[model samples]
Target chain A: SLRRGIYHIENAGVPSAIDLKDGSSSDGTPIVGWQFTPDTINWHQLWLAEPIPNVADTFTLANLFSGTYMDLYNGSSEAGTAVNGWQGTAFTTNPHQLWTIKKSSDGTSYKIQNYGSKTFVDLVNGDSSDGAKIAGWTGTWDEGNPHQKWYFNRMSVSSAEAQAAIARNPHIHGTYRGYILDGEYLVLPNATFTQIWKDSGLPGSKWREQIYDCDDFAIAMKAAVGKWGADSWKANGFAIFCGVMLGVNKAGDAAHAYNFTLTKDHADIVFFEPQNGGYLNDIGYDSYMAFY
Target chain B: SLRRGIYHIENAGVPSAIDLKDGSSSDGTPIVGWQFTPDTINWHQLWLAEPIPNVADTFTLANLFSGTYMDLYNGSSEAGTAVNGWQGTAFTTNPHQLWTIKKSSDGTSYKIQNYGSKTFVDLVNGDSSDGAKIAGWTGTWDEGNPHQKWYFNRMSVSSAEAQAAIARNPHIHGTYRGYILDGEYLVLPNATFTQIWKDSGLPGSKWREQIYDCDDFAIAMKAAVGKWGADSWKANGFAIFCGVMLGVNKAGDAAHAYNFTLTKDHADIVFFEPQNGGYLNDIGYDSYMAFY
Candidate 1:
C-alpha cells in the first residue's frame, strides 16, 4: 500500500542523510535510485543521507537509476559539460547535467541505465565553487572531480534531518562571474525548473552564494519553488531557493561537469568552468526543467 | 247518545212537535226537546197527536228509561222553572204549548228551543218585535193571554233545508243593525237570543208575547240562546228590554203571574204587571232574574 501522507528524503540512496532541510516526496518509491516494498517502507523512520562527494562527476547509485537526479559541486573551478543517457553518445558535453528523467517522473518507476565502462560516484559533501567537474568514470568508483566532492549540512539538527529528506533531488547553487556558489537549493517542489532559476536573481552574472550557509540558499530555493501541497510560494509567509549539477565520468576519470541553480521561475541550470580562463574555459548553461 | 252535531226543538214537553223544514214547534207541547244517539232520528216524523192538549196541563215521559224525561207543564205555570236534567229551563206560558223543534241549521245538530207556551204570541208572521215572551204552557188551550199565540212565515229559503230552516226565524223589519247585521254574524251570529234583542229597537221595554210575533220570537230566541244551553231570556243581548212571565192565564190576571227582566245596568227585576192601569200588582209570587 502507498503511504498516506507526505514524506521527505535528502540524498535518496543513503538512509541517514541530513543535507538540506526543506524538501519532500510523496509516500512511495524514491524518485531517483531507491526502492522498497510498500509494506516494508517505514516512512516515519526514513531520512535522506548526505550526498557523497563527487557524486555529480561520476555515476552513483542515484545516477544508475532513472529519475530526476541532481548533485552538488564544491570547488573553485568550473567543469566543462555534463553528460547523461538522455544525451545519447558518450563523453559529449552539455552546459547542465540536471537531467530530468521525464519517463520515470511521469508517476512511474523505471530502471536506471548502466552504460558500459561508465563508473558511478558520490558527491554528497561538495562545496559551491568554480572548477568542479562532474563526470561518469569507471563503474561505481571514486574520481577526483571537484564536482563529486559535495557535503550536506542541516540547518537544525533536530528538524534538519527530516528537511534534508525532503530535499532529495533538488539543485544547490548559483553562478556569478564564472564562479559557482552555494547559493540556494530547491526541495520537494512542484514548480518548473525554469521558474526556479528566473525567479532567483535574474539570469547570469547576478547569481552568487555566500557560504556553507548554503542552507539559506536551500531555504530560499525551497521557498521560491514552493513545497508540494502548500497553498502558494509565500503561503506560509516565507521565501526559499535551491540548485543542482550533472557530470560525466569515463574510464575512472571525471571528465565534464555542469552546474545549475534552482529558483521559483527556473528550477535548474548548467555551469561550465575550463582551465584556459577564456571563452573556451568559461560557459553558462540555463535550461527549463520539470517533474512530470 | 247525544247527537254529534246540533238539533233544534220549538217546544220542550211530551208530544212536542218538530218543524223538519222551519225548525219550530208552536201547535202542541210547550216543551220542545232534543236527544242524541248513534242511530239517526228523523225529527220530521215525530207525531203531534198523542199528548192531551189542554186537559192535563202537565206531562212527562221517559225515553227507554234512560233516566231522561220531558216534563210539559204543571197546573201552576211556575212549577217547571228548572229544566230538570236538561241543559236549560223555562216556565209555563202560552207559546210554550206551540213550539217548533228542529235539527241545527248549521249542521251542528243542536235541537234549538223555539217556543214553550201559547201565551207568547207573534204579531207578524216572522218578525221578532219587542215584548215577545217564551215559556211552557198547555197546548191549544184558551189561556186568554197574549203569550199563547204564535205565527210562522218563510224568509229567504235555500234548497238546503238546514239554511232555509235558519232563515225562517224572525228578522228585524227596517235596516240591519248591531255588529251581527254588519256581516259579522259569523263572529257574533244572529243565532244567539242575546244578540237579537240587543239589536232590537226596544231598548228598555219588557217583552210581551201579544206585542210581538211569538213563533218568530221562539225561533229567533232559540237561535240566540239555545246553542249556549241557557234560557233565551237569560242571555244578555236578549235579556235587555224584556220581561219573562209565568202562570198568567189572562191578559189582566195579575194574581198568578211572576215577572223576570234584567235592568239596563244588568240588574234583575221581578214584579207583576199593572192591572186596571193602576199600581203594580203584588201577586204573592216569588220571582228573580240574575246575570251570571
Candidate 2:
C-alpha cells in the first residue's frame, strides 16, 4: 500500500529490491521491463508520496524528488501496458497511475490495485525468488503470498540521521579524515547508479566538494542504489563491505576509504570509490593496512 | 655429466633455485650462502665458461658477462667453505672455482669437484624445497640425492626465434604493432631472469620497441625469472601465465598482457608485469584469453 514519508520499497517475499532497469526508460516512452543490479543507485527504489486524501479513498503515488507520477501506456485497463514515471506535477490527472490499496479481509496486509486498470500488482509468474520481475495481475485483494503485501522503509539521509552513520564510523587516525556539508548532498537529487558509477574526479569535477570522500559516498550510494533497486527486483539484499586503505599522497602518507559488495553469484574483488564514481584499480597506491 | 650447452641450475631435491643473494659479495669479503627466489633470473643463474687446458680433461666456469668466477672462502679443503662468486678475469686462477667433472663409475652421470677444495659442490643440508637457501656440503663424486644430480637448459633469444613468437601472438591491428631488432635481444647476452626482470621499458625500456609488445615481454620475463631463479632456488620451478586484457587506456580502446603465478601452499594470486617493472592492477582490464 502507498504510504506517506520517503520509503524504501522492496518485496515482502525476500530481501531484494524492485530495481528499475537502467537505459530502459527513454523519451516519452513508457517504461517496459525492470531489472536487478544488487544495491546500486537511488533513483531505482525511492518512492515517497503523501496520502492525497480528503477525497473519498482516492490515492496517488508520485516519485520522491522528481514530482513525476507513475503512468502507463494505452491505459488499456489490461495486464501488460508496461509501467513508467511520466512527467507531471499533478497526480490525479493520470487515472492509470493513481492506485488504490485494497486491504485483505485478515486486516494485516493489502494488495495494490490500479484505479484505471482495476488490476492487482502481482509478482510476475508468481515467482517469489529474489530479482523476479513484477507486473499487474487480475485478482481480488489477497495477502496470502509475499508479492501482495508491501513493505515501506526510509533512508537516513536527513542530517540528523546520517549524523548517526558518522558516529558509528571509526575516526582512528588513518581510518578517517576530510569534511562534508549536509546541505551539499541535499542539493543533488535523483542520483542513479549508472550516472554516479560513470562519473569521477575531484569534488567539484564530479559534483562533489572537499567534505566529500569515500565514506560519505558509500553511505549515499548505499541509500540511493538500494532504494532505486527495490522498485524492480527486491530479492536477496547485497552485502556491503567498507574498508580503509593507508596509501600516500604527493606530500606524505595518506589514507583513503572505499566500498565494495558481495552477493550470491558474482564474486569479484571490485573496490568502488564512491565520490568520483571510480573503481579501486584507478589508483596506484600500495595498501599497507586494509580493514573492513 | 656437465656439458657445454647453456643450462638452468637449481637444487634437485626441491623445485627451488640456487639463487644469488644480492649485497652478499664484495671485494675481499666472502659471500654468504645463496638464497632461493622460486623463479628465474638470467644474471642470477647463468654459469659461463668453457674448457680449461687445451691439453687435459678440464673445465673452467666463469660468469659470462661480469667475468666473475665462483670462488670459496679460505678454500677449506675439508667440508664447508661458503661457496661464492668472486671477481676474476683469468681462467684457472682460483683453483677452488676451477671444477673438474669426474664421471660416475657407471659413466651415466658425473660429479663436479673443485681443484683446490677437492670436495664436490653439494647442497648444504640437502634442501629441495622451493625458495630454500642453498649451501655447500662434503661429498664424494657420486650423484646420489635430489641435491646432487643437475640438469641444464636454456632459451636462446634469436631474431628468428622471437619472430616466431610475435607471429603466434594476436596482433589484430593494435595487438600486433611493434618492432624489435634481433640484435636488440641478442646484443644483451646471458640476460638472466634476474637482470632483465629488473630492467624493462620497451627497447631502452625492456629490450622492446613499438612492435615488441606483450609477446616479447612475456617470453623474456619467463626466461629471466626462471634462469635468475634457478641460480638460487630452482628447486621447484616457477610458473608464468600470460593473459590478454580487453580494456580502455587513458585514451580510448586498449589491450594489454600480464603475468601471475600460483602455489600449492598459499594459493594466493600474485600478479606481475613484464614490460615496466610494475605489477598489474594498474587499470581494471578484463582478461579474455590466458595462456599458462
Candidate 3:
C-alpha cells in the first residue's frame, strides 16, 4: 500500500533540494532547486500528500510552502516549459495535478509520474549538481534519472495502534523527522523539527511518561497523508541519517519507544533520531512489540 | 512467605535513624542511632536477609556493615538490655541471631520478635527522635508499636521476564523505591544495592525509554541481588521515605516498576526510592507485573 504521509521530496540521483523558493509557489513561477543548508527539516522543503480521487496508487501533491498544488505551467501540455504549482487555487481539473506513485520492484523506492504529462519528473538538462533545477521531461526511467525519484520523510505526530503500543510500551509517545523510503533519503536542511521539540519543553524528561515522543510524530505524518495502522518500535542509538518508522520487529527482548520507519515488505527500513532531528541510515532499536 | 531481600532497619515510630553503630557488638556499646547526613544511602546502613532454617515464618538477618548478626547482648535472654550486633565474628550459632518474623493482618507490615527473647524489634526508651537507638521490647502488634513493625523493601533488581519487558517497553527501565505491602516485613537496608546503581550513570535520560525508568535500577539491582525472574514497571518519582518492590499490580493499562512493596494481599511490603535512597508514606508506582 501507499505509505501515505507528509514528505520532503528530494532528487535521489543529484541530491539537490527542490524548494518553493522564498516560500511562494505562485502559479507560473518556476520552483527552486539548489543546495540548501542547516541540515534539518524546514518549511521551504515540505509537500503535503493526499490520495488521488478513487485511485489505488495515485496522490495529489501540494506545496505547504506556497499553499499550492504541483501543477503544469499554466496547463501547458508542452514538455520543455518547466513545472510550477497552481498558486492560490485549491481546485483544478488539470491532469498534471495528478501523480501516480509506482513502487520499484525492490520495494524500497518509487517513481512518481504526472497523469497530465507522460514524462516523469526530471532534473533540468539532466544535471547532477547540487544547484541543478527540477523540471519535467520525457526521459529513460532508470538510475540515470536520479532527480525523478523522490523520498518521503514524515513530519507529523502519533496514531491509535502506534499510540497504544507506545502507551503500552514504556508508556510511549517525539515531533521529529519521520521514516524514509523511496529514493536515497537525503538530509533536509533546516532546524525546525529539532527546535520545535526541544523548546516545546514537553516533559520528555524521565519523569514524564513519554506522551509526545516518536510515535506521535509518525501518527501526525499518517494523518496528514491519511493512511496508516501500525504500532511503533524503539531502537539502539545509531547516528545514520535516514527516514524513521514507529513499530516493532521480531528481535531482541526489551521493548523500546523511538524511531525507524518500516516498509510493509520489511526489506528496507530507515532510522531517525527525533530528539536530535537526525536522519540516519541505520536502525537503533533493540526489541519491538507492535500489533502489526 | 517472607519477602527475601536485603534492607536497612529504620525505626518506624518516627524518623529516628537506626544503624549498626560502629558495626560492633562490644558487650555494652550502643548501636549507632543518629541523624545521618546528606540524605543518602551508606554502607553502615545495610543488612543481608535470608530465611531462618526452612522455617514457615522466620529469617536470619546478617549484618553486612559489621560482618555479623543482630545479636542479643551477651545472649542474656533478658527483656531489657542494649541490642547490639556481634563484633569481629561471622559465625554466631547463638539463637540470638534468629528472628521470628510475624506478618500482620493487612499484609503490608511485619513484626520481628527474637526467637530467643520473644520481644519485637524496638527503639530505645520508646523514643520518636531521629537519633534514637533500636532495641527489643514487648508490645502490641499494631500501629501504636510502629517502631516494632517494619516493611520489607526490595533491594534486588530485574529478572529474565522482567528484563524482557523492560527491553520491549520503549527500551526503558528504571531506578526506584518499590512497594510497601500489608503484612509482616522488616526494613533491612543494604548499602551495596544503592551504591552500585548511582555510580553506574546509565543514560537514564529524556530519550531513554523508561516505562518507569527504575527498570535500569532494578536490572542492576537484581544483578547485584543476583536473583530475579519478573518483568518490571515504572513509578512516579517519589521523594517519600518508604520501602520498595519492583513489580506490578492489575491496576492501570501500563504496569508500574517500583512501589510500596506489600505482599499480594497488601501486607509485608516496603517502600523505596532507589534513586534517592529514602523511605516515604506515598505509593510510588501505578501497575505491577512480576512473577514472584
Candidate 4:
C-alpha cells in the first residue's frame, strides 16, 4: 500500500529538491529545484501525496504551502513539457494532476510518470543546479539515472503521531470575538510543542509594555503553533488568550495571557506560558475569560 | 460591466442568503440559504465574483470563506438538480462552475444561471426560511420571481480603502519566527483598524501574568486584522511583535509588544497599541527588536 502522507521529494543524487517559486500560492508558479532546509519549517518544499480515490496506484501531488497541485503545462502530451502548480479540478480523472509512482527494481528510489503524458518527471537536461526547473520528459526508468529517481522522505504529522486538541464546552465567558471557537484543533506531543516553542524564538523575545508583553507572547506562540501544525491538521485552530486568575504572588485583578490545549490524554486543561514554556499547575478552565 | 468585487449575494425578498455549510472549505459542501449577518464578519455568505477570462458575461462565484466555487451537481443539465460548492477547474470555460448574472427587467434584482446546466439558481420551493436548500431549476428571468432573484451587496475592502503594509528592510533584529517575515501584509485605514480592534474585544480583555499579557494582546489584534483583511488581500501576513524602548515612566530593559504598519502614503512607520487602540506618538522603526 502507498503511504498516504506528507513527503519531501528529494532528488536521488543532488541536495536540491522540489520547491515552489517565490513561495507563492498563485497558479502556474514554477516548481524548481532548491536546497532543503529541514532544520526549519519548510512548507514550500513539502508535498502532500494523497491517493486519488477509485484510481488504483495513482496519486495527486499537492504542495502543502501553496495548496496547488502539480500539473502538466496545459495537460499537453508533448515531451519536455514544463510542470507547474495550478488550481485543482473536481474531475477525479484530471490526467494532468495524476501521477503513478513506480519503485525501482533495486528498491532504492522511485520514478513518477504522468497519467496522461506517459512522461517521467525529470529535471531539465538532468541539471543538478539549484535553479533547475522540473519538467516532464519521455524516458525509460533506469537504475543509474539519478535525475529521474526521487527519494520520498515521509514527514507526515498524522493523528497516529499527534493528538487532537478537542475543546470541551468551548465558549467565551465574556464578550469576545473569534472567527471560529468551537472546533477541534491539533496538539503535538509535549516535547514537540516545546521544540516548536524554541524554534519560534519566543523564549528569546524580550518583554515590553504595550508591545511584546504577556498577551503578545501568548498570541505569538499560538500563531507559531498554528503555522507549524497546519502541515498535518486542516483545522489548526489552537486557542490562546487571556484569563482571570489569583496567583501565589498576585491577587488583585490578575489577568494573564497563556496557551492552553486539551488532549484526550489529559483530564484537565493543559495550560502553559508561551513566554517561558512553563506549565502552570492547578490552572482550571474557569479562568479562561476570553479566547481569540 | 460586471462589478469584480466581493459581495453578499442576498435573496431579493428574504433575509436568508447563500452560505457554505458549516463555513467549511471542503469540496461538495452544500450551498444553502441562511439568514444574513452583515453586522459581523460573514465570510460564509460572502462571494468573490471573478470574471472568467476569455469568456464574456460569465464568471465564477467563489465563496470567500470556504474558497470553493458554486458548481452544479455532476454538471447535470436536468432541472431541480442540487448546486454545491466544489473545487474550481483550470479550464476557465468549465460550464459547471460558470454562471451568467442577468439583470431583471425591473432592475431591482438579478438572476443567476448555470452556463452548463442552463438552469437558474433558485431557492427550493421559494422557501424564505433559513436552512432552505438552494438548487438549480429551469426558469426564465421574471421580475416578480423573487425565488430566483438576488441582490449583490458589495462588501469589498479594496486597495482604495486599505493600505498594503510593506516591510521596509524587514529582518528580525533578533532570532524570531515568522513563517515569512519579508513579504507584504495588508492593513486597513487607521480608523478601520481602530474599529477592528474594538470589534476584536481585546480592549476589554483582562490582563494577567503568564497568560493574557501585552504580547498576547498585540498578537490577537494582528490575528483579527488578518482575518478581516483576508476578504480582499490574498497575502494577509500582517506583522505584530516586540519592541525595545525607553519610555516616560520606565527605562531599564523595557520591551513592549505593539503593532506597526507601513502605508504607501506615509514615509514613517505607523505604530499603534492593540490593547487599548492607542496610537503611539513619535515612535520610530528603530525600536522594533523582533517581528513574529
Against the true structure, whose TM-score is highest?
3
Return the candidate ranking by TM-score, descending: 3, 4, 2, 1
Model 3 alpha-carbon drift over 4 Å, by segment = A1-50, A53-56, A60-98, A102-120, A136-265, A268-292, B1-56, B60-99, B103-110, B113-120, B136-292
| Candidate of highest DockQ | 3
lDDT of 4 by residue, A165-273 (tens): 2234332233221222212222234666677789977778765432245555665677566445433322111222222121221243545556655433433346677
In order of DockQ, best first, we have: 3, 4, 2, 1
Write one digit per residue (lDDT tens) for candidate 3, span A1-292.
5554456666665556567656664565566565554345455666656665577676766675465777656444456646676653323456777767776443555666777676666667646564455666665445445556665545432232233323332311222122111211212222433343344332242321222234333322222111100001111111112222333333434333334343322233334454444544444453222211
Q: Write the per-residue lDDT of candidate 1 for residues B72-107, one digit (tens) a residue.
A: 333134423322212112223433232333223333
Higher lDDT: candidate 3 or 4?
A: 4
Q: What is the RMSD of candidate 3?
A: 14.6
Interface RMSD, candidates in the order listed:
74.6, 23.5, 15.9, 12.2
In candidate 3 the C-alpha lDDT for residue A72 amounts to 56
TM-score for chain A of every candidate model?
0.19, 0.46, 0.55, 0.61
**Model 2 CA lDDT for position B165:** 50
The C-alpha lDDT values of all candidates are: 0.24, 0.43, 0.45, 0.61
The deviation in Å at residue A106 for candidate 1 is 36
Candidate 2, superposed: residue stretches over 4 Å from native:
A1-292, B1-6, B23-25, B28-39, B53-57, B63-67, B102-110, B128-138, B143-147, B155-292
Q: What DockQ does model 3 achieve?
A: 0.02
Which candidate do you rate higher for lDDT, 1 or 2? 2
Clashes of 2: 84
lDDT digits (tens) for residues A1-292 of candidate 1 = 1111112322222333211112232112222212222222222222222222333322222211121123312211222222222311112222122221111222222111122222232222332222222333222222233322222221112123223432442322222112111122223222244444455432331211111112122222322333221222211111122222222222324322222232212322223121111121123322121111
Q: Show the lowest summed lDDT stretch of 10 residues, model 2 chain A.
A: A180-189
